Symmetry: C6
Subunit: 219 residues, 6 copies
């Protein structure tokens, strides 16, 4: 990654064994549960493209997912190239060249080039641009590997309401509900999918109840 | 987080793998036992809003609780906006803009903006403001998930007094008793809820006994 | 805590995850065995009052003990206030104010205030003052939770002398014997509580024997 | 390794116990799965030839592989020597000498020499050159130890498509398919090797389907 | 401990959780096996008297041993006082005072005093002096807890010679043989205590055989 | 060890708990497998003689080996003294004295002396000299504890060739074959010791086959 040192300057540091191990372990334990994405983001703080590729390459399993991620990256890189075509022909001696999509993804750029872009004034934040593409791909994979529709999350007759709500919002997270549903699912589907006894109580609360109020009512 | 370096200056540092792992593990092990809150507070020392969101987002389960926390945050952010309305229209070039509630919660602000607010002279401590909202929400969740009323903590006939007192004050902590009860429960309910033999002894101690004195008397 | 940096200056640093985890684990494993106190002391090196409260608050169980500790703190804080009354009325702008007992215990003071006191020339060492109160309380709890009188530590007929002496001095430590007994128990109770065969040998050694000499004699 | 310090200068640092342990453990756990290579690369960031030899020498098992790796190194070192012959006869006093292949591999050079080459302006990056030879050898070993032809990865009649695709691309990775196959295997062999029911569906998708589309179709 | 910082100056640093944990664990696992002493010495690098007391106080069991160690310390402190009596009467304002034995052992000195002695030019190395007393005491305890005489280490008829020699020198280490025996036991008791078959072979080697030669001969 | 700090200067640092633990664990797990030597070398980067003795002394078992190592050290120290006799009689005040063999081994020198030698311009690298003696001794022990002759490593009739080659080169490593055999054993004994079926195939490959080619042929 690129870090600031103790005297305020941006320099390259090796990825730590701790970081490497943390990432491998989170993939091993959590697969593509939604919470893997914020963990990736955090563990890739300051990452170069080379570092991001390192992280992805350390994943041993989940190769269907890793191929989908490559496809996503290739699409974003192609879009980059449409928006930001570079002049061809030899680079001015000693001067920074313009990154193409493949350079952002670290396939056709050196570490030295990546460092140069990321620490330029003003910077071309190739680490952050690539990380965005990766996260886009990861979110697609999370959605793919989500096993259950929100339509199929219904409170059992002997299921505590809190347990149901846990399942409901964990499923919405994976399914990657748009903000309206996340926000309002409370008013709609959460009540509809409750068991008959809790549904009766929730209906009687009337509109605008907080989740705290609902959970209290159905305790 | 924002830390001071070795030469006395405030700069941004990535959240460490150790910090990330510690938080996930404490939620995994302790759920919303009251002691999770001081651990959150400690692990989020110097945190930006982005860091706080990272921490919250790394939680995989407990999604009912995480939705209640969002609701709490939204309420505090709305109150912020009522107390501190911002001027609309384009920002003066190069100048710090005023944070709205959504900016404090990290949904509409960049890391660079957050750093700028937190390190301004004087600072707008958006990390600490957001952390307060989060802790407010966490305390509500602790109360919610507390399973037992203090009224139902009564000393068994074969239960050592110390074991009872442990249960009593652990329950009061979760229930989030006001200071009077925490302070005085000793004089009131703790004695009332003791078993007959210990109650007889405690009654005979008369008023103002310390907890040490009570525990000695009922050993 | 407040630490010196690499250039010799006293600044605030966040409590580390390692420190936090070490403390929780020592309480989990050792409860209020006497050796918990030196571990607390060591793990709270340089601690502010805020840090000390963090450490105490991270304890999930042992709430009878934690309430006794609060009582101890309240007594010491009240004594502080009797010895060091503060002038009331508004503080001189920009100037350090005088700490009350509640400020030392971190209930009515900010982190910024605590830092200011601890790093003043000359300092008001509020961390060390509070730590002393806490340790006083912890020692009371160690004594309380000590299960066995020294009077009841007697060498079994088939018990190796070393095993007995281990039990004896572990019990004296918890019971918190005054220096005379720690020093001289060797000459008195240790011999009296030995089994008949070892007692006969120890009696014949005559006065002033070292513990090494006693242990050799009864091997 | 050679690292930059806190003031921006390139100096030698000992290989850490953490790095050493991470490498041994990855070989112990993963043998020569393809993901071992990016882990080697990452753990050898900034490595001298001496460090690289340390890493390789810490491997206790897999001695057939380690002998193949030596053979690969010897071939690359011989090629180096053909491309970059050195002048014989005594070195100018005090001056940097030119590295031979054996010097790059760390068999005939000192640590001091390696440091001198790697930190020269301009550098002779002997660590990176040697690392390339090692990675070439490691890739040969990965291919060797790959147990299964891609021709033999066929979807079972009761095997979820995702599970099949996982096996397929994990095998292609080890077999070290050229870019065309990695890229296009999707259009060819992946469909051919699918079970009859999924094959029927995939055929009907027509050309140019993304892997995401295929996986959705065969869910 | 007192350490040098990054700019070459001697300052106080808190004892780390890692150091604390390492020491407790070595006592837990190894008791008073001889190898505990070098581990103590290493973990107490740069220690103040306060740090050394911390380390000793963190030991929960082995209280017979810890009381013997106190006795040893008291003897060394008394000898210190006989060799280095201090002038009584009030200290010159602002000036370093002379340490007594109790000050070296950390019972009557502050951390500030200890730091002052250890960093004086020239220093009064109270940490190293106390550590020597402790190590003297620890060595006595190692000898005490050594269960077996070297006279009783004899090679079994079916025992490999190497296994016997392992037992022999492990016992000599604990028994704390003087240099002559350590050096020459090879020529004497090691042969005498070998089984008849190996003894016959060793006798025929004649004088001055290395241990390597003996072990080869009896393989 | 002696390390460079963050400003480029050579100073003494305590051996870390991590280093100590890593070494003990590698001896516990691996005994005197050949791979222990590179691990020793790596963990003793920058070590003083005092540090090296610390490392060796922390080993609890394997005392036959540790006595052989002492013997090796004594021989090398005696040779040092024959090659580099020192002038007797009192040292010039304030001046560096010349190390004898016992000083290099850390038995008759202080830490301060060792630091002085190692950081002199030009240095007398007593750490590296002693480490060489230790490694010489360790290699002798590895050879000693190697249980099996290369003559006895023969491919089983149902043993995969790769498994055989693993055993073969692991045995050669321990036996510490000279370079010719390591290099050429491939052409000779490896084929001779193969099972009849693989031997037939290898014979037909003719001379100069790589190990990769052999392993492919016998798959
Ligand atoms: C520069 N770069 C890389 O080193 C990527 C990084 C990467 C990207 C990703 F999206 C998923 C990953 F698991 C690993 N790694 C690989 O190509 C290695 C590999 C993994 N599984 C594989 C399965 C089959 C196979 O024949 C190779 C691989 C790279 C980076 C981005 C893209 S987009 C298309 N190709 C690339 C290549
Ligand atoms: C900027 N920001 C965030 O990245 C929050 C941070 C956060 C806040 C919180 F209160 C609880 C959490 F678990 C996570 N994270 C998420 O929205 C992701 C998520 C978790 N569970 C979910 C369940 C369903 C779903 O469709 C999304 C999520 C954010 C931060 C504060 C608020 S208040 C209303 N929305 C937001 C969004
Ligand atoms: C500022 N301050 C604190 O944050 C203390 C720190 C503390 C002190 C202590 F002695 C024991 C502890 F476990 C925790 N923490 C708590 O009050 C929280 C708590 C723990 N168990 C509880 C059981 C019941 C309950 O309703 C609250 C708590 C604080 C600090 C000192 C004193 S003395 C009287 N009250 C205070 C409060
Ligand atoms: C300088 N250098 C080294 O210290 C190499 C480093 C190395 C290289 C490698 F390709 C694989 C490894 F496991 C270890 N280590 C060894 O030779 C020790 C060894 C391991 N297994 C062995 C099996 C048999 C044997 O008689 C020795 C070894 C070295 C480095 C490169 C080459 S190429 C030909 N010889 C060398 C020697
Ligand atoms: C300043 N100082 C200390 O804090 C020593 C340090 C120490 C020294 C030692 F030799 C063994 C230890 F386990 C702990 N710790 C204790 O006295 C506490 C204690 C442990 N087991 C005990 C058993 C019974 C008891 O009533 C107290 C203790 C101290 C230090 C040196 C000496 S010599 C005589 N008394 C002292 C006291
Ligand atoms: C300065 N120095 C040391 O502290 C050595 C370091 C050392 C050297 C070594 F080759 C093997 C080791 F396990 C430990 N340690 C010991 O002597 C302690 C010891 C271990 N096992 C023993 C078995 C019996 C015994 O009566 C003592 C020991 C030292 C260092 C080098 C030599 S050569 C001859 N004597 C020495 C002494």
């Amino acid at each position: 990654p690129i870090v600031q040192n103790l005297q305020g300057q941006m320099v390259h540091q090796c990825i730590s064994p701790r970081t490497l191990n943390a990432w491998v372990k989170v993939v091993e334990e959590k697969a593509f549960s939604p919470e893997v994405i914020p963990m990736f983001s955090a563990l890739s703080c300051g990452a170069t493209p080379q570092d991001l590729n390192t992280m992805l390459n350390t994943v041993g399993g989940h190769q269907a997912a890793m191929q989908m991620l490559k496809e996503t990256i290739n699409e974003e890189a192609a879009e980059w190239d449409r928006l930001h075509p570079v002049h061809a022909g030899p680079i001015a001696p000693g001067q920074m060249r313009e990154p193409r999509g493949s350079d952002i993804a670290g396939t056709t750029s050196t570490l030295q080039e990546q460092i140069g872009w990321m620490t330029h004034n003003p910077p071309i934040p190739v680490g952050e641009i690539y990380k965005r593409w990766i996260i886009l791909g990861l979110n697609k994979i999370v959605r793919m590997y989500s096993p259950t529709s929100i339509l199929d999350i219904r409170q059992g007759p002997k299921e505590p309401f809190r347990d149901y709500v846990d399942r409901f919002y964990k499923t919405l997270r994976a399914e990657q509900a748009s903000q309206e549903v996340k926000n309002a699912a409370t008013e709609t589907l959460l009540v509809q999918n409750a068991n008959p006894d809790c549904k009766t109580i929730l209906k009687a609360l009337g509109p605008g109840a907080t989740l705290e109020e609902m959970m209290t009512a159905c305790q």
